[PDB]
From Swiss-Prot, chains A, D:
Disulfide bonds join C6-C11. The lineage of its organism: Eukaryota, Metazoa, Chordata, Craniata, Vertebrata. It comes from Homo sapiens (Human). It comes from the Eukaryota. This is Insulin A chain. Coiled coil: none annotated. The chain holds residues 90 to 110 of 110 of the full protein.
Length: 21, 29, 29, 21
């Protein structure tokens, strides 16, 4: 999930936008 | 600001800035 | 910290603090 | 929604927790 993709590894805009409504 | 490790309030902040009026969901495992 | 007007990043911050490991959804109209 | 209850009017713990997962 988001913690794995953005906290434990380097985040990206691409991944962040998957969590926008 | 997005291309780094982002945890906790830092991650929430990035979601807020990126998603704008859409809003977002923040759901840890 | 919750019993006030909370907008924007301030509201996101309150959700983050209150909801803890649950996480939350932030969905403006 | 949340903006109406917490930004435009005074927020509460009660209302915030309705938006926790």
């Amino acid at each position: 999930g988001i913690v794995e993709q953005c906290c434990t590894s380097i985040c990206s805009l691409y991944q962040l936008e998957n969590y926008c409504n | 600001f997005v291309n780094q490790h982002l945890c906790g309030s830092h991650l929430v902040e990035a979601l807020y800035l990126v998603c704008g009026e859409r809003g977002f969901f923040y759901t840890p495992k």
